[PDB]
Design an enzyme around this catalytic site. Structure first.
Site, PDB file in Angstrom:
ATOM      1  N   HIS A 105     -11.103  17.242  -6.270  1.00 39.49           N
ATOM      2  CA  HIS A 105      -9.901  17.790  -5.786  1.00 39.49           C
ATOM      3  C   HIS A 105      -8.721  18.227  -6.882  1.00 39.49           C
ATOM      4  O   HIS A 105      -7.728  18.723  -6.523  1.00 39.49           O
ATOM      5  CB  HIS A 105      -9.221  16.882  -4.683  1.00 39.49           C
ATOM      6  CG  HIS A 105      -8.356  15.759  -5.262  1.00 39.49           C
ATOM      7  ND1 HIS A 105      -8.800  14.491  -4.827  1.00 39.49           N
ATOM      8  CD2 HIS A 105      -7.370  15.573  -5.909  1.00 39.49           C
ATOM      9  CE1 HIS A 105      -7.927  13.534  -5.308  1.00 39.49           C
ATOM     10  NE2 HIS A 105      -7.250  14.260  -5.879  1.00 39.49           N
ATOM     11  N   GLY A 120      -0.382   9.966  -8.422  1.00 44.13           N
ATOM     12  CA  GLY A 120      -0.994  10.477  -9.865  1.00 44.13           C
ATOM     13  C   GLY A 120      -2.081   9.345 -10.274  1.00 44.13           C
ATOM     14  O   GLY A 120      -2.569   9.316 -11.317  1.00 44.13           O
ATOM     15  N   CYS A 144      -4.940   8.875  -8.940  1.00 45.74           N
ATOM     16  CA  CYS A 144      -6.233   9.278  -8.666  1.00 45.74           C
ATOM     17  C   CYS A 144      -7.033   9.228  -9.973  1.00 45.74           C
ATOM     18  O   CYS A 144      -6.684   9.983 -11.027  1.00 45.74           O
ATOM     19  CB  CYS A 144      -6.476  10.468  -7.796  1.00 45.74           C
ATOM     20  SG  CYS A 144      -5.211  11.661  -8.048  1.00 45.74           S
TER      21      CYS A 144
HETATM   22  C1  LIG Z   1      -4.682  11.637  -6.508  1.00 46.73           C
HETATM   23  C2  LIG Z   1      -3.628  10.564  -6.071  1.00 46.73           C
HETATM   24  O1  LIG Z   1      -2.904  10.261  -6.762  1.00 46.73           O
HETATM   25  N1  LIG Z   1      -3.937  10.072  -4.750  1.00 46.73           N
HETATM   26  C3  LIG Z   1      -3.771   8.669  -4.815  1.00 46.73           C
HETATM   27  C4  LIG Z   1      -2.567   8.209  -3.615  1.00 46.73           C
HETATM   28  C5  LIG Z   1      -1.245   8.647  -3.930  1.00 46.73           C
HETATM   29  C6  LIG Z   1      -0.247   7.719  -3.619  1.00 46.73           C
HETATM   30  N2  LIG Z   1      -1.333   6.410  -3.396  1.00 46.73           N
HETATM   31  C7  LIG Z   1      -2.526   6.686  -3.651  1.00 46.73           C
HETATM   32  O2  LIG Z   1      -3.464   6.066  -3.787  1.00 46.73           O
HETATM   33  N3  LIG Z   1      -4.470  10.788  -3.943  1.00 46.73           N
HETATM   34  C8  LIG Z   1      -3.786  11.567  -3.340  1.00 46.73           C
HETATM   35  O3  LIG Z   1      -2.276  11.778  -3.364  1.00 46.73           O
HETATM   36  C9  LIG Z   1      -4.291  12.426  -2.290  1.00 46.73           C
HETATM   37  C10 LIG Z   1      -4.335  13.768  -2.697  1.00 46.73           C
HETATM   38  C11 LIG Z   1      -5.511  14.627  -1.583  1.00 46.73           C
HETATM   39  C12 LIG Z   1      -6.808  13.867  -1.495  1.00 46.73           C
HETATM   40  C13 LIG Z   1      -7.804  14.659  -0.701  1.00 46.73           C
HETATM   41  C14 LIG Z   1      -8.063  16.228  -1.321  1.00 46.73           C
HETATM   42  C15 LIG Z   1      -6.753  16.749  -1.471  1.00 46.73           C
HETATM   43  C16 LIG Z   1      -5.709  16.043  -2.194  1.00 46.73           C
HETATM   44  N4  LIG Z   1      -3.760  12.162  -0.910  1.00 46.73           N
HETATM   45  C17 LIG Z   1      -3.629  11.053  -0.107  1.00 46.73           C
HETATM   46  O4  LIG Z   1      -4.413  10.172  -0.520  1.00 46.73           O
HETATM   47  C18 LIG Z   1      -3.132  11.271   1.338  1.00 46.73           C
HETATM   48  N5  LIG Z   1      -3.816  10.739   2.180  1.00 46.73           N
HETATM   49  C19 LIG Z   1      -4.445  11.389   3.310  1.00 46.73           C
HETATM   50  O5  LIG Z   1      -4.314  12.512   3.507  1.00 46.73           O
HETATM   51  O6  LIG Z   1      -5.498  10.631   4.255  1.00 46.73           O
HETATM   52  C20 LIG Z   1      -5.980  11.308   5.184  1.00 46.73           C
HETATM   53  C21 LIG Z   1      -5.066  11.472   6.471  1.00 46.73           C
HETATM   54  C22 LIG Z   1      -3.927  12.355   6.685  1.00 46.73           C
HETATM   55  C23 LIG Z   1      -3.018  12.209   7.881  1.00 46.73           C
HETATM   56  C24 LIG Z   1      -3.465  11.211   8.679  1.00 46.73           C
HETATM   57  C25 LIG Z   1      -4.405  10.330   8.694  1.00 46.73           C
HETATM   58  C26 LIG Z   1      -5.053  10.469   7.486  1.00 46.73           C
HETATM   59  C27 LIG Z   1      -1.957  10.415   1.387  1.00 46.73           C
HETATM   60  C28 LIG Z   1      -0.940  10.667   0.010  1.00 46.73           C
HETATM   61  O7  LIG Z   1      -0.903  10.529   2.455  1.00 46.73           O
HETATM   62  C29 LIG Z   1      -0.482   9.444   2.930  1.00 46.73           C
HETATM   63  C30 LIG Z   1       0.456   9.827   4.102  1.00 46.73           C
HETATM   64  C31 LIG Z   1      -1.641   8.878   3.894  1.00 46.73           C
HETATM   65  C32 LIG Z   1      -0.059   8.467   2.303  1.00 46.73           C
END
Ligand SMILES: *CC(=O)N(C[C@@H]1CCNC1=O)NC(=O)[C@H](CC1CCCCC1)NC(=O)[C@@H](NC(=O)OCc1ccccc1)[C@@H](C)OC(C)(C)C
Ligand SMILES: *CC(=O)N(C[C@@H]1CCNC1=O)NC(=O)[C@H](CC1CCCCC1)NC(=O)[C@@H](NC(=O)OCc1ccccc1)[C@@H](C)OC(C)(C)C
Lengths: 301, 301
Positions: free
Chosen positions: B41, B138, B140
């Site tokens: 991603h 950050g 990931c």
């Molecule tokens: C890349 C990164 O740092 N990371 C780790 C996260 C950030 C905070 N704590 C973590 O572990 N991942 C993300 O920020 C990702 C980025 C996306 C991944 C998919 C491809 C596009 C880029 N995002 C998230 O982890 C979201 N989660 C999410 O969207 O889950 C699916 C979902 C959405 C809505 C409802 C139900 C399920 C996080 C940051 O969002 C939430 C609100 C869940 C914390």
């Protein structure tokens, strides 16, 4: 989100660890520049160490760093540590300091056997100057440390285990934490207490991460809090502790004394089968610094 | 003695961590020989990644390793990971393997931001294929790993956080653990269960370290145990699990099914205000291997 007992990355210390052997005693040493630090009880055969050490020669000391022999060219004793001068400076020597920490402060321990790192975990120096570690035969000389940007602040070297299964050691200048001495006589840990300011820090961690069930409407004075704290074997909270919890207070919108009122009711009522940050006990081995570091993202390199 | 959540020494992985930047997205990557592995991603702008990636050039990818620019000379996508070919092989590449672990297995996580290691902690892969981590924006691309003598077995790369605050990711070949997908739609953790064989391992740890208060006179059959386990949301114990607990059973003199009888009464009666290994909950994130390693002294180098 999430909250874990986080240790510092250990690589900078791994590159300093060596095996020290003399006579039939083998333990760990810490190689920084051209000196190897290790516990003085490596000295051969109730002991008078000055008398024991004038009887040793340099070639009595075998120092292994990996598959490499290190040659000892001088030695001296500073309190309870031996300092062995070697003919080669450790090329992996990080930027470093030696520091004597206060009780309540945390650090990472790199547990080591035969100069080979085995694991890393986080500890606190208890109010009674022991640490609840995880140590087996041969671990003496393992060190505890913190990292600030690029700098390793060494604060602990492991020496002994006490009858209750807790651990005693020195700063890296060889001064014991607590009243303990390096002889196999009869010593016990003094009675311990809970690190109150750390407990409050962890409650703020819980709020930062979304747990709120333990908050309340009440407030308290510093004095009336300490009256309930002393009852439950908690350390007194001072105004310095209050000031330290400032940033966490400001980030969450919860006055320090308000979170003291919350702790008060947790102590008087128990937790009623709920958990906080995955724990059914009040946790006291995170400092206010630890909480901010893990919930803001501070790295080190 | 003592018992801690012990992570593996992290130095071997620290030397592999890099920053990958392309477009406005920056995350962590893992540099082994002349390939950098990172979550796909990172690709610019509900997504079709094959379509997105044919639109990128090599110079779109900025890889920093310390103060050094790394030049990308090829790229390919394998499931949910991107593999970036660089013109320089990492001279700190340890001996390594990629491995896809089973739920119940533990590993160390080196949490990283901007290619800079921040902390290390121990985790388990839950039965529902999440991990209860500690991760911020950050993180990931941070990896999870185990060490066997000199060999790093990478098993996890971090990708996302789920609404309940738990974490989802992939093996290092890019296959998600669990049913999760790398898009920001709507996904939830399935219902979790307690890792029974790990709980039993930890009770054996307690006995090795001197805690005995929870043992009893009773015994049980595998089937009658599982009948009580299912009631309390514990995973079934299989005969393979029983066999795995053999060595611990032999070291302590407690038949596996005898310690199952003890667990049974712990579940039915609660812990009555006592603790086990400093915990007031039944702990399930130590494998039988973890216990033996920490209570016998196994090092790695
Ligand atoms: C890349 C990164 O740092 N990371 C780790 C996260 C950030 C905070 N704590 C973590 O572990 N991942 C993300 O920020 C990702 C980025 C996306 C991944 C998919 C491809 C596009 C880029 N995002 C998230 O982890 C979201 N989660 C999410 O969207 O889950 C699916 C979902 C959405 C809505 C409802 C139900 C399920 C996080 C940051 O969002 C939430 C609100 C869940 C914390
Ligand atoms: C060097 C080392 O590995 N190490 C760490 C210990 C070993 C197991 N777990 C550990 O943390 N230290 C020791 O083994 C030292 C060696 C002595 C230190 C003093 C100078 C001579 C060499 N021994 C111990 O730690 C003793 N503890 C001890 O004697 O405490 C004092 C005491 C004695 C009797 C009654 C009360 C107090 C350990 C190994 O012995 C016990 C039985 C307490 C575990």
């Amino acid at each position: 989100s999430g909250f874990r007992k986080m240790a510092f990355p250990s690589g900078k210390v791994e590159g300093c660890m060596v095996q020290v052997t003399c006579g039939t005693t083998t333990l760990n040493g810490l190689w920084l520049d051209d000196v190897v630090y290790c516990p003085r009880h490596v000295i051969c055969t109730n002991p008078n160490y000055e008398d024991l050490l004038i009887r040793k020669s340099n070639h009595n000391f075998l120092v292994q760093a990996g598959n490499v022999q290190l040659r000892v060219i001088g030695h001296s004793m500073q309190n309870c540590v031996l300092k062995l001068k070697v003919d080669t400076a450790n090329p992996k020597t990080p930027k470093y300091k030696f520091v004597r920490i206060q009780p309540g402060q945390t650090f990472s321990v790199l547990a080591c056997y035969n100069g080979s790192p085995s694991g890393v975990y986080q500890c606190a120096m208890r109010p009674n100057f022991t640490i609840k570690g995880s140590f087996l035969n041969g671990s003496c000389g393992s060190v505890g440390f913190n990292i600030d940007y690029d700098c390793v602040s060494f604060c602990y070297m492991h020496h002994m285990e006490l009858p209750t299964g807790v651990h005693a050691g020195t700063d890296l200048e060889g001064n014991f934490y607590g009243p303990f001495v390096d002889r196999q006589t009869a010593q016990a840990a003094g009675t311990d207490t809970t690190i109150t300011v750390n407990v409050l820090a962890w409650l703020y961690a819980a709020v930062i991460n979304g747990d709120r069930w333990f908050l309340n409407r009440f407030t308290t004075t510093l004095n009336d809090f300490n009256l309930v704290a002393m009852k439950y074997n908690y350390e007194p909270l001072t105004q310095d502790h209050v000031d330290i919890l400032g940033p966490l207070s400001a980030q969450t919108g919860i006055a320090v004394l308000d979170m003291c009122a919350s702790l008060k009711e947790l102590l008087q009522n128990g937790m009623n089968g709920r958990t906080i940050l995955g724990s059914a006990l009040l946790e006291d081995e995170f400092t206010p610094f630890d909480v901010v570091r893990q919930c803001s993202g501070v790295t080190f390199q």
